[PDB]
Amino acid sequence: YLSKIEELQLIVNDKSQNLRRLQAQRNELNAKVR
Amino acid sequence: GIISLLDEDEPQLKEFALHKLNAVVNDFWAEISESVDKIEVLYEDEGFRSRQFAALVASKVFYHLGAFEESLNYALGAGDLFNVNDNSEYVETIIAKCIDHYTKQCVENADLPEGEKKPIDQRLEGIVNKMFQRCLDDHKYKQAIGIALETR
Amino acid sequence: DLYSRYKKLQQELEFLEVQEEYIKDEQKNLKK
Amino acid sequence: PPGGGEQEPPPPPAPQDVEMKEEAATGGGSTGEADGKTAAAAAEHSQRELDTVTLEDIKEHVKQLEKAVSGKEPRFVLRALRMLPSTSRRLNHYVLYKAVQGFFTSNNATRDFLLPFLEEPMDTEADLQFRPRTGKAASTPLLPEVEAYLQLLVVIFMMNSKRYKEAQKISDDLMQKISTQNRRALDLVAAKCYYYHARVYEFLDKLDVVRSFLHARLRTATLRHDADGQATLLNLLLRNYLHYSLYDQAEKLVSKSVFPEQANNNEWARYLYYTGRIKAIQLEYSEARRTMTNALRKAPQHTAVGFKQTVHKLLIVVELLLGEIPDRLQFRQPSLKRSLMPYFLLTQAVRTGNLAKFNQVLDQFGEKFQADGTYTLIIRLRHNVIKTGVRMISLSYSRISLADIAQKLQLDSPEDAEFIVAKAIRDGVIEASINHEKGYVQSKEMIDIYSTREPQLAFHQRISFCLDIHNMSVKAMRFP
Amino acid sequence: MYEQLKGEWNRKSPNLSKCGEELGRLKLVLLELNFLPTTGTKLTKQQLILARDILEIGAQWSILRKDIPSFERYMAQLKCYYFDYKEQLPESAYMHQLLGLNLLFLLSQNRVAEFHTELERLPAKDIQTNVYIKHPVSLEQYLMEGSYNKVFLAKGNIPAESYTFFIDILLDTIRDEIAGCIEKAYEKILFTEATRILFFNTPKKMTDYAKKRGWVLGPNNYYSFASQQQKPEDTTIPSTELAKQVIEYARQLEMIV
Amino acid sequence: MSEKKQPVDEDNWDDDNVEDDFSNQLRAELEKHGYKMETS
């Protein structure tokens, strides 16, 4: 059980990936405008 | 509503009190938040007989709170009645608390055990190798070598 | 495989730490 | 009778078409595409399954006589489906059983074969693997048997269908829940079935055994998994611990689980409402009225849907208990006048200084109070009524006699006009001075510590709110 | 069965070794069965029903001896008994006014949130009837705003049991209620009306009030002093709380990340 | 969608505030004038 639930609640943290999606489109905006 | 019953001096209301604590805890789960110190008196006293099961019900109720450091202290201090109970799914929580504290403790003792060691309770390191007996005798050696690398 | 499948995720956690720190300074720099 | 003879064939097949293909396409998408979808706590076909549940909340409830869904149960339960090449003949059987239903009439097996309508997920060493398949196929058969609303000899078989759903809880809590979120698909399915489970327990006694089961069902979140099941189970724990008086509410206070952080705007809004009522019962008003107002304006999406008018009812209870009060029928509906007008006559009584109008309404509609469960207004609302009356008359008269205002407000005596106005000063309502030799209460007026202090505090709230509008607007605009 | 369970039941008990035998008998009851529902064999609660009766007379002996945490101990026991989880509920002797006892002292603790969450488990019992619930909450209905001596008329008529050890706490919480609301616009009051309202005609309690309080004992008159605020310096706590608030406005308008 | 779970169940309004002032007392107040012009 110890090596089981830790991976699951690690993969819970993937909203930071969607924040990176937001910021990647933002960097796309600023870089293309520049 | 059994809090005022935890004031009587004789143990033969206190054993019945814990005997009904673990009975109606399933309704009164968040009750002992207002009875912390009344469990502390029934635990810490060296003239009381059934002091360890106060730490057992305290383990249960501070698990219901989510006080994993308080339940870590109780994972130590609950005694042999703690260690005898491992066929459950509270056992993953006790190894969560103790083994996580233990592997960051082994990162601490991966810095300087050559002097100024932290004295380690025999249940703290006791359930380490004693839960590791499950990997010693239960046919699995990748989990065994995983813990043996986590213990540093 | 769970030793590997758990240990390799710490790398990606470190990566998301790095890029979340990084795009902030990029966003601050691009207005200049 | 020949007219009814040709009114018999057209009612089956069009439900037998769309009621078929909804779970065909939707459940196929859900069960198959729940393999991937990195956020499959509910797939897009699981929200589509929510939408079909909204459809058959008004389309069909019962197990469907006239032989229409009566064959859909032994069709859709008889599914071994061991592997996909062993499912192709079953994909043909999805139409072949319709051919059986068209060639002959179907066989409606009610209340006898329903328990061996639960042995077909065992057919020739069948599967426990796809538990959202078997969970959705244990909800969508077995919950319309509860929407039959029979309450006769099969509530125990309702319960045994829910015991096989406890076996679905066993397969939920043992069978390989690593990253598939079959458990969280079953947490939304668990929400649904726990509402209908709950309605079964509404037609029967208190579920204190199943309340302990529900305790464990709540506590099994946050540690094994933690998404939205804690929300649904929190309100499903609240539902009767409100209705039962004792402890439960200090538990709502010390509950470190107020925050499941999203609940499809339905459960979160009604959660705000339930905890608003909870904070309202312990006389705390300003903390409660804001979440009452937010819960009213948060899930409004009908016109007079019922419990929307329960929240719109209860919302101005605490504001009758404040002193400031709005006119309630600003959201009056043509399906609402019955359930607004005695309550509107109550607030009509309160919006004047009279108390003889107020005292009659208790004896008038105390049976309505017995229905509504709001006895606590009448023990303490007299206080607010007399504060409103003395506030009004103190703003009216610059210098009043106590032995006039007392009999104008039926106090029956002048000596406790001293008491009531003395705590209109002690409680901080009025500043007015008294000579307690002649019995005259002179009142004066001022401004400009108003204007130095009072408006800017409100403007701080206004701009904190509008900058929060700006914050949420940008941080929800930036998805593209 | 159950040896001399109601021995000194009718007369009195001025002794406490008898009450020690009583508490040891209750200890024997707790060793015997329970106070929890014991689901099989509901009818074996003869010792529990008669135990509630001897706990009621223990609460009477405990309000006689004034053992108030033990009074609320027996109160919590019997209150959880009338809120039993098994819904059988046969009637008892002090049910309709034991909640009145708890209502009385939990009003005398100023547990107003407890006072209004306690009134829920008996919906129409507390409202339609039971004057030793309705009259304590009508007493509190008079204690709502400010009425002093009408409360003492209601206190001057209770033909139920004692209530005295807690309505004297209610006396005192009205004593400091007049001693609180004295400081308002009673700009001068003649002494004997304060004798009427306060209590005690020519006491040393007039020395207690006129000396522990202010209200200078002059000629036939408690005299009112004057105090002011001026709002002088602040002007600055306005200025610094506006410093905080507009630093906050500028801070939220400021954000950028 | 949005099935709203069911176990449970100007022109109009500013002058309804003013009408709550007008409701219990003096509804059609036109005659009480002529009623009280001769009383005192």
From Swiss-Prot, chain A:
| Location in or out of the cell | Cytoplasm; Nucleus
Q: Tell me the first and last residues of the signal peptide.
A: none
Its family remark reads: Belongs to the AAA ATPase family.
On assembly, the entry states:
Component of the 19S proteasome regulatory particle complex. The 26S proteasome consists of a 20S core particle (CP) and two 19S regulatory subunits (RP). The regulatory particle is made of a lid composed of 9 subunits, a base containing 6 ATPases including PSMC5 and few additional components. Component of a complex with USP49 and RUVBL1. Interacts with PRPF19. Interacts with TRIM5. Interacts with NDC80. Interacts with PAAF1. Interacts, in vitro, with the thyroid hormone receptor (in a thyroid hormone T3-dependent manner) and with retinoid X receptor (RXR). Interacts with ERCC6.
Task performed by this protein: Component of the 26S proteasome, a multiprotein complex involved in the ATP-dependent degradation of ubiquitinated proteins. This complex plays a key role in the maintenance of protein homeostasis by removing misfolded or damaged proteins, which could impair cellular functions, and by removing proteins whose functions are no longer required. Therefore, the proteasome participates in numerous cellular processes, including cell cycle progression, apoptosis, or DNA damage repair.
Identify this protein by name: 26S proteasome regulatory subunit 8
Q: What high-level taxonomic lineage is stated for the organism? A: Eukaryota, Metazoa, Chordata, Craniata, Vertebrata
Portion of the full sequence shown = 24 to 57 of 406
From Swiss-Prot, chain B:
What protein name does the entry list?
26S proteasome non-ATPase regulatory subunit 1
Role description: Component of the 26S proteasome, a multiprotein complex involved in the ATP-dependent degradation of ubiquitinated proteins. This complex plays a key role in the maintenance of protein homeostasis by removing misfolded or damaged proteins, which could impair cellular functions, and by removing proteins whose functions are no longer required. Therefore, the proteasome participates in numerous cellular processes, including cell cycle progression, apoptosis, or DNA damage repair.
Give the gene that encodes this protein: PSMD1
- Signal peptide positions on this chain: none
Family per similarity comment: Belongs to the proteasome subunit S1 family.
| Subunit and interaction comment | Component of the 19S proteasome regulatory particle complex. The 26S proteasome consists of a 20S core particle (CP) and two 19S regulatory subunits (RP). The regulatory particle is made of a lid composed of 9 subunits, a base containing 6 ATPases and few additional components including PSMD1. Interacts with ADRM1. Interacts with ZFAND1.
From Swiss-Prot, chain D:
Q: Which PROSITE patterns match?
A: PCI
Q: Give the species.
A: Homo sapiens (Human)
Cross-link Glycyl lysine isopeptide (Lys-Gly) (interchain with G-Cter in SUMO2): located at? 21
The record describes the protein's role as: Component of the 26S proteasome, a multiprotein complex involved in the ATP-dependent degradation of ubiquitinated proteins. This complex plays a key role in the maintenance of protein homeostasis by removing misfolded or damaged proteins, which could impair cellular functions, and by removing proteins whose functions are no longer required. Therefore, the proteasome participates in numerous cellular processes, including cell cycle progression, apoptosis, or DNA damage repair.
Q: Glycyl lysine isopeptide (Lys-Gly) (interchain with G-Cter in SUMO1): where is this cross-link?
A: 21
The protein depicted here goes by the name: 26S proteasome non-ATPase regulatory subunit 3
Residue ranges of every copy of the PCI domain listed in the record: 269-448
Assembly and partners are described as: Component of the 19S proteasome regulatory particle complex. The 26S proteasome consists of a 20S core particle (CP) and two 19S regulatory subunits (RP). The regulatory particle is made of a lid composed of 9 subunits including PSMD3, a base containing 6 ATPases and few additional components. Interacts with UBQLN1 (via ubiquitin-like domain). Interacts with ERCC6.
Q: PANTHER family annotated for this entry?
A: 26S PROTEASOME NON-ATPASE REGULATORY SUBUNIT 3, 26S PROTEASOME NON-ATPASE REGULATORY SUBUNIT 3/COP9 SIGNALOSOME COMPLEX SUBUNIT 3
Region of interest (Disordered), residue spans: 1-52
Swiss-Prot record, chain E:
Query: What are the residue boundaries of the PCI domain, all occurrences included?
Result: 69-238
Keyword rRNA-binding assigned: no
User: Main role?
Assistant: Component of the 26S proteasome, a multiprotein complex involved in the ATP-dependent degradation of ubiquitinated proteins. This complex plays a key role in the maintenance of protein homeostasis by removing misfolded or damaged proteins, which could impair cellular functions, and by removing proteins whose functions are no longer required. Therefore, the proteasome participates in numerous cellular processes, including cell cycle progression, apoptosis, or DNA damage repair.
Taxonomic source organism:
Homo sapiens
List keywords of the entry alphabetically: Isopeptide bond, Phosphoprotein, Proteasome, Ubl conjugation
To which protein family does this belong? Belongs to the proteasome subunit S14 family.
Cross-link position per record: Glycyl lysine isopeptide (Lys-Gly) (interchain with G-Cter in SUMO2): 204
User: What protein am I looking at?
Assistant: 26S proteasome non-ATPase regulatory subunit 8
Q: Which domain of life is it from?
A: Eukaryota
